[PDB]
Design an enzyme around this catalytic site. Structure first.
Site, PDB file in Angstrom:
ATOM      1  N   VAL A   1       0.849  -1.207   0.000  1.00 13.78           N
ATOM      2  CA  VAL A   1       0.000   0.000   0.000  1.00 13.78           C
ATOM      3  C   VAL A   1       0.887   1.260   0.000  1.00 13.78           C
ATOM      4  CG1 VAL A   1      -1.834   1.186   1.315  1.00 13.78           C
ATOM      5  CG2 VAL A   1      -1.641  -1.330   1.267  1.00 13.78           C
TER       6      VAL A   1
ATOM      7  N   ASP B   1     -14.029  -9.898   6.126  1.00 14.17           N
ATOM      8  CA  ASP B   1     -12.742  -9.807   6.862  1.00 14.17           C
ATOM      9  C   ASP B   1     -12.599  -8.486   7.576  1.00 14.17           C
ATOM     10  OD1 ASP B   1     -10.336 -10.788   7.976  1.00 14.17           O
ATOM     11  OD2 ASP B   1      -9.180 -10.230   6.152  1.00 14.17           O
TER      12      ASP B   1
END
Length: 292
Positions: free
Chosen positions: A18, A121
């Site tokens: 990221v 999740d």
């Protein structure tokens, strides 16, 4: 990055690196997520999420499939709830702010569930906060696209702490209820400043649940004894009072938590019904203390 400028590597995510980056055309600061490959079906599925827009869902700005790579471009937020809780440990997050955050999170869930999209999740690391008192759900609809791996691309064990019991018992059919379970676990961690069920293996996760909520049986969860990973040899633990599990949460909060943590996914409260719970009759939207 013929289209961006990496400000920095931020983080090593579930699926790939990221970045914080700057869009060259617009100058906007965004989160760029590289999705690592070890698939045409994933692309169409993930692309539909560009329409799943809500104030409590991190905005999916683009799905960029170029040079045989997949990048997801998201709206950038400065903090996540995992870091915020860690930073709030000595004091706790104030109850009005816990309430605001849970209320907003349920709004986001209710929106996505209405469009038949699950998260599957949820965890504090994918709940992002801003200076304005908002909280947003990151990574919705991704799991039905890439799965949830045991390990990340850098070998970081993916947490089991927020996983619903039906998933642990080997049920392949997910329902919206898995997300309500994870959010209830998160709600208990905000209040007590400790993870509710911090398992370190599937069976440790499942037995931590059973020691608090009681070993499930056909009375409380019709069908449980026929689930794939159920074993008749599972120890039989008694169920703890929520008064002992999440002090000093009040009776309204304890009632709502109990409904979010019902074993039978069909008994578990929906996000829409949770928004109408008396725990929210005095909800407000405070300004949090954020240091960036």
């Amino acid at each position: 990055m013929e289209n961006f400028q990496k400000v920095e590597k931020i983080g090593e995510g579930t699926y790939g690196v990221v970045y914080k980056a700057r869009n060259k055309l617009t100058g906007e600061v965004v989160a760029l997520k590289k999705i690592r490959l070890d698939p045409s079906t994933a692309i169409r599925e993930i692309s539909l999420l560009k329409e799943l827009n809500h104030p409590n869902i991190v905005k999916l700005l683009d799905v960029i499939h170029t040079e045989n790579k997949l990048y997801l471009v998201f709206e950038f937020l400065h903090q996540d709830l995992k870091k915020f809780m860690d930073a709030s440990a000595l004091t706790g997050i104030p109850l009005p702010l816990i309430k605001s955050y849970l209320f907003q999170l349920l709004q986001g869930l209710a929106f996505c569930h209405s469009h038949r999209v699950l998260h599957r999740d949820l965890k504090p690391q994918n709940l992002l906060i801003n200076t304005e008192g908002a909280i947003k759900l990151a990574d919705f609809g991704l799991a039905r696209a890439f799965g949830v791996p045991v390990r990340t691309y850098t070998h970081e064990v993916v947490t089991l702490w927020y996983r619903a019991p039906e998933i642990l018992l080997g049920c392949k059919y997910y329902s919206t209820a898995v997300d309500i379970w994870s959010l209830g676990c998160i709600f208990a961690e905000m209040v007590t400043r400790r993870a509710l069920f911090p398992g370190d293996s599937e069976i440790d996760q499942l037995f931590r649940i059973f020691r608090t909520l009681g070993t499930p049986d056909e009375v409380v969860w019709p069908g449980v004894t026929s689930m794939p990973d159920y074993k008749p040899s599972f120890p039989k633990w008694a169920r703890q009072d929520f008064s002992k599990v999440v002090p000093p949460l009040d009776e309204d909060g304890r009632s709502l938590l109990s409904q979010m943590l019902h074993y039978d996914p069909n008994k578990r409260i929906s996000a829409k019904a949770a928004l109408a719970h008396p725990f929210f009759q005095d909800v407000t939207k405070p300004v949090p203390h954020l240091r960036l």
